[PDB]
Amino acid sequence: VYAWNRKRISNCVADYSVLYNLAPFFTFKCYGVSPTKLNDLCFTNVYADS
């Protein structure tokens, strides 16, 4: 949890729909955004911390 990877994404087209295809019992809580309006705002860099 202290040594987390930080992936840097580049110019591409992200499909935020495969996130809910895995096994059930998973949370999708957002902060400041919404899943239905996620594909409306334009972002420069998205960083994933696992």
């Epitope: 040594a3 987390w4 990877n5 992936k7 696992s50």
Partner: antibody, heavy 126, light 108 residues
Framework: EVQLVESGGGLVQPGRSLRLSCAAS????????IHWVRQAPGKGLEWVSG????????GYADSVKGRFTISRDNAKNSLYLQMNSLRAEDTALYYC???????????????????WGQGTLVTVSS | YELTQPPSVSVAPGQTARITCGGN??????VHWYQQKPGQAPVLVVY???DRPSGIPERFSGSNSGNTATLTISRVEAGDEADYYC???????????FGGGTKLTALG
């Protein structure tokens, strides 16, 4: 091409701690796995630990659990290994090996070394 | 896991040698091989018994049959004397099980 510079090693008292480092040069430090594997003088080799392309531990041996801690740094492109509670049976040449495959998402767990280094003599005695 | 390797195998530089690595039920998992020269750095040889890295000639080959992985070296010379190691994955324990390498020495 590939220059895996290994640093850290010397004479330390039994029970102390140290930090070994392996820096890559030549390839991208985001799509290759790197492992630490010791080699006793004239007594074969012994795998210590390893980390995949991302920040992920793969496991350890049956005699190094709880004492060693491996970490990865993609910002500085370096694999670090912290060793604690060293004993007399930890004197070997710790080699920093790379991986050949790109370690795609969906595959089978099969990691094998492709490039080797020089190793650092880390002796533990009084 | 635990691999069993011959302590030392010597052969004249006229025929091929027999470097075998066997286990208990190793029939489908991948088997890799490495060649470390004494004093220098190890190098990769024919792995998975179905392909070879870039630079390794056709002299090296690997063959798995049931419970024995054999590393066949063709036309062994004086400059081929090194320590051959065989590596397996053994996903049951999440480790990398090595073994005592064989010191191939060209006799004669």
């Amino acid at each position: 091409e590939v220059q895996l510079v290994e640093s850290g090693g010397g004479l330390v008292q039994p029970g102390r701690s140290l930090r070994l480092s392996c820096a890559a040069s030549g390839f991208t430090f985001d799509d290759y796995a790197i492992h630490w594997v010791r080699q006793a003088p004239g007594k074969g080799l012994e795998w210590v630990s390893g980390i995949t392309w991302n920040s992920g531990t793969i496991g350890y041996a049956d005699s190094v659990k709880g004492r060693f801690t491996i970490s990865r740094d993609n910002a500085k492109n370096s694999l670090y290994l912290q060793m604690n509670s060293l004993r007399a049976e930890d004197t070997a040449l710790y080699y920093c090996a790379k991986h050949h495959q790109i370690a795609v998402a969906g595959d089978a767990e099969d990691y094998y070394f492709d490039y080797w280094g020089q190793g650092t003599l880390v002796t533990v005695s009084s | 896991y635990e691999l069993t390797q011959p302590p030392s195998v010597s052969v004249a530089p006229g025929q091929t040698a027999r470097i075998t690595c066997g286990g208990n039920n190793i029939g489908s998992k991948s088997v890799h091989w490495y060649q470390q020269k004494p004093g220098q750095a190890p190098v990769l040889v024919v792995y998975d018994d179905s392909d070879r890295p870039s630079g390794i000639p056709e002299r090296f080959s690997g063959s798995n049959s049931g419970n024995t992985a054999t590393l066949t070296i063709s036309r062994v010379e004086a400059g081929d004397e090194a320590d051959y190691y065989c590596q397996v994955w053994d996903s049951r324990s999440d480790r990398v099980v090595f073994g005592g390498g064989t010191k191939l020495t060209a006799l004669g």
